Point group: D3
Chain length 297, copies 6
């Protein structure tokens, strides 16, 4: 009766995925799959680590904790072995494509793929859906942070004169963002050139961007993040319906936990690929349906 | 292709249900069913009003806008004619019973019943479910108001010395409520007897309750309401995950609009009875799946 | 004893003015005056609609619900028939002119004109006045929205490549505004030309302006609006006196309701033209002076 | 052209009244009237201090800064000398009586009395009036503090075992108040007797009351105060209109400043007695009408 | 140059103390001291664990992570071996006693004891001190939670009919607390007896207390906590100075981290015992004095 | 036993310093030192005013209330007479220099200098220090205002066409500031030249700057100010620790009061110069150590 889960990849969300699986009484961790099996941090000392998911035996579902660019090929491979897949694929514009690619393969092998099951895309996606169900006309805004942006950190690091970089995302409302960029300069680089180059880069040129030089970028890092979603709109013909959702959260802890909840849900769907807005919300939860209904509805 | 809807009952939510149906391009109002067809307010002048749903022809789904005590018998009758039912049945402790009673009948007649599809139970139920999917351990609180409580207004009206009454629900946090009761006294009643009797009544004795005498209770009435839900808990093994949902809304406008969204969803489920936490959230929405996914996920 | 009111014009605020008049027990609706009497929406089926105010008989006061540019000529004409006028004339820089023009005419015909009696100008004007009465030195800021700006919507619609447009006003504090513009493009228009042209237009060039392309501008529309006023200043010689006023409101509902309250006040003033800061606030209210004083002061 | 003002009484608001008069360019301080002329604090060294208002010559208006119980007799006496009166008479239930008593006398001597012109009653009274003008149906709440309550401090001091006392008013919403009472005990008094007696006293028995013993009550004193007013109600037939007013203020500084603004207004009214909701708000302000209209409306 | 630290006791704060020591580059963990050395959780696999601090060699300072009742005897013993002590001793009324007991012993052995170095007592104590330095007159309130209270959980567990219990502390302002108690009942216990007994117990009888029965108390547990401190008072002779401090934090993570900061500070004081308000704040920090001054002041 | 204090300089903070000294029971004002002894405002009528500190006899400590540029030379002179010095020297980048210059001189003459003891630098500096003690990794932001900036007012006044100017500092979060500049134009100056010149000046070119023309700049002035500090970071290895500090305060009242608290602390330090993060916080307070510990810790 226990849901047998493999963790594929072990980035930041990998360690938190392990924690989420161990905490879930209804899940059995059958092991971790990574390219370098000899890098073993403290928490993987007593955990089966392989470079081939087949060595873990019977596996119901795989949490894909791999880089964005690897998710598609990785999910097809694991669906093709008759294992379910959950990912947190974060590229909004490409989610419809990923769904159709994986739907073909999931259906051929009678398995379920749940895609883009982080907090955004993921949880937040369900809240945005609920807001249109409550008031279909009007405007929704999603406001991120304060939190780190990996994408923007990389983009700033990859400029001439920048040894290391940290980009913070700051919410200014109505989906508008301020970017606070902290840079370690390469010995002998010119600050004003680096600053102008970061501000002019395609990742930053749309947005109010500030750049400050620092000694250590690492001591600024915190995986705390957050969201403030607003909806102002019309229920039927009644205007000025106001809805708001906020959270102050640990980024990878939430991403990994929602992926585990999605993996649980994956076991109760007809073969195919699904965004989290296509899953009944109660399917994300452990326990007896009627106890859950009595507690929640 | 248009979803053909009948409104059964026409209380407060009835008028707002009519507005929600008219506003929905994908819905066709095939008429209103009520016991007194000769009470016709301005908005029902050009609307078909019958005392028998059979006279409305082909009807896909019925919005049950009737008193709580009538919902069960009413839903079985309409499911038995081969029509779907949506209600906002608001008695939390009885939802599991209602679901099983209606599931039998819905399945015999190959129809769908969506029950308890207001904002609480309803929308709020989905948010509470999402909070356990994001952080299964910890505490959720649901804080109502300020808004009118019909139940508590009735309970106070039904006491000796009280001509009319209005009970306000005031949120004090962690699910604790203050009740502000405004009373019109019957000519010659004793205030302090009425006050003590209201405070001692079973509907008020658990709660901080204040009673003030007024001339006109009607001029205090406003159908505005609201909720503040909090969840503080654990994602995997990471503590102090903080989530919050708020809305300031028109009560019947939201209740009726969510019922219309639920009616839309009813057309896409396998025969049976469902709480709204058992429906994929995107099924509540009008439009092309892939356009919705691109917009929301 | 009942205040006999005509509604002249029937734009957006027209429908809400009708609602406000019907709700007021001390007001009798003697009819609606409009240029096209054959456009009759559901709510005007049983309402007298004429193109000549003289056909409505004895009329104490007219609510001018007409375009800004028409208000002056319209008010002089109706004052000249011996009827009071209330408008929500919204051009701040021209209010002193309008007052003097109408004061001449109101005094000749022994009638009262109340001008600029919306929420801004209107209600907000009284709050700004009270803030100087409480602390004459210091700074007041008035922060609008989120809400639709008709002026800015029109200005964006009236550009090459723009089929339809919606401009949102977003408050950023200290009277500074962000403008979120949503555009429907004419078949074959170039987005980046339209975007730059909107941002460079005189209505938007002072302000942080964002432009997004959409399918349907209508589904974003909501007549919800709001204000946050701050005053920080000196009472006598005591500094750091902090005052704040907020509202989240239905825009036309409030505008029309304040106009009805102003019409009530118009019946108790000496002949002339008045801004709402020149009227005793209690004159806006129905009821017995002493009951009102006991309730409010 | 300068408004000639006498200050009668010199309690706490007396010192602040002097500051407000000196700061107002349009006011000339013609002196201070008090029973003990030989108690002269630093600020009254160069100020004319008399026990008879007649010695101050031509006086347009008197600020009555005397105890509540003295205001009525004091105002009649000064109106009878042909001088205007402003007070901050704070007993809400008695304001209609005070108005009629003073109206008789003000009219006989062709003078103006403005009564109950503090912040509550006073400023707050105008905001409550405006809220009914904007939305006549619904509920208003006025929430005080945190701030000192003189009434409640006295009531606690006047109990057996209490040398000195300070009562704080704490807002809990919907007009419900918590009272934090700090007591200095008389040498040899029993705490639990004093505590129960304070909690059972008529001034405290309606309200959640806490009592803590302290060494020095004086070091806790701060004349900071505040208000949060809410209105939730109906504009015309549109529900869930939300309005809010807040201030964090110096109590006597605001009381005295509003009294000076009221004194300015007193010079522009027809003979009689007035609450501040019966005065046009612009009459409270110094300057040219048209400059004020351009700035405020 | 590295500060050599032993962890004595390994309760909840023990695990977090280990994390805080490992994270600090200027600290060297020389081991953990506990009574049961054979209970070894995952994180202590490669950590020296002894029942005698002498086996750890040269130790500069000991973090006392032991029960409250053990701290005094434990600190004297370790000071007597020529090692510094830091504790988070949480009994406010006994801190002056603990300081004098440890001051004698610290001075005899030329060592430093820092006591009551959690967040309250601890960090919060410094903020309360700063508030009197900024405004010596007025009132400070410290508002805890929402968070778990170990003291109150124990007190409720230790009642007849209660298998397990969790007490939540809820802030209601001005230092007033609501207690939400969740109980697992012993097979066959009577709820209403248990409820009344918890509410009447000395730990709960002063406070608004609610009791709810649950299946699993463990799934409600979260070590998140928080504080809201307010100060309203006088700077010199200027009233209504408003100060506020908030945090939403992991309870043991903060307690343990402040203890590590205090241990760092302990190395720079003259022999004796100290509360954290007797230590220069910069002594809590790693780094070069002048770099810290440039960054912070 | 009374701390004997001289006030040197009498700018804005001078008057408030006098108030703070008079209010402190443990301080004796031995006089005021200023260049112009014949400018004597109301409050200095009975106060000894000299141009030579030696005439005031035995003085323990001097509050330097002089311009920034004068503080260094002034402090050396007064330390050299065997008197302690407190200043609020506000140039952050130069604090390490000032400390070393004054440390030499303070040590030669066996006296104490406390520097940069306002609210920023000063109080805020201690809060920023505490935030690193609680969570050493992460980001702190300090957000100022709304309040007047003297520096920015001067910079705008000192431009061609500007008779007078007031610059307001507005917090936009993450240490980013908006500047609202109000200008009185010299008879015949061109607004658009003045506006562009202010916006291009080095004091404003980094920041969002708005310029409005006004009649009287003086009537906008208020010495109210404020701060919002945030810290988001890591306690040990636990992320998303959230800390916040706010105040709404009278600027000079707080600056002067903290300087008096610092002067008190100066009497208990070993000879030298100190920033306020190098002083034990309890040394800022009057009273018995053990009473303070019992009250605060």
């Amino acid at each position: 009766t226990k849901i047998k889960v493999a963790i594929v990849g072990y980035g930041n969300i990998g360690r938190f995925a392990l924690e989420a699986v161990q905490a879930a009484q209804d899940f059995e961790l059958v092991g971790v799959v990574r390219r370098d099996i000899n890098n073993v941090p403290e928490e993987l000392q007593n955990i089966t680590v392989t470079n081939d998911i087949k060595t873990l035996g019977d596996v119901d579902v795989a949490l894909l904790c791999s880089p964005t660019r690897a998710i598609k090929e990785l999910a097809k491979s694991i669906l093709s072995l008759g294992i379910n897949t959950v990912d947190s694929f974060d590229v909004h514009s490409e989610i419809v494509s990923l769904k159709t690619e994986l739907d073909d393969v999931a259906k051929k092998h009678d398995r379920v793929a749940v895609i883009s099951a982080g907090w955004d895309p993921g949880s937040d996606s369900i809240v945005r859906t609920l807001m249109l169900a409550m008031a279909p006309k009007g405007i929704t805004y999603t406001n991120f942070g304060p939190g780190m942006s990996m994408g923007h950190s990389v983009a700033a690091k990859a400029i001439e004169g920048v040894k290391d970089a940290l980009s913070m995302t700051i919410p200014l409302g109505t989906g508008v963002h301020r970017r606070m960029v902290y840079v370690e300069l390469e010995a002998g680089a010119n600050f004003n050139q680096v600053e102008q180059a970061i501000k002019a880069d395609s990742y930053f040129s749309s947005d109010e961007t500030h750049v400050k030089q620092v000694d250590s970028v690492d001591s600024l890092k915190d995986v705390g993040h957050g969201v403030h979603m607003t909806h102002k709109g019309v229920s039927g013909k009644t205007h000025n319906q106001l809805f708001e959702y906020s959270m102050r959260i640990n980024n990878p802890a939430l991403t990994s936990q929602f992926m585990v909840s999605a993996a649980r849900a994956s076991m109760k769907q007809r073969a195919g690929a699904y965004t989290v807005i296509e899953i009944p919300p109660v399917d994300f939860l452990a326990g007896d349906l009627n106890t859950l209904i009595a507690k929640l509805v």
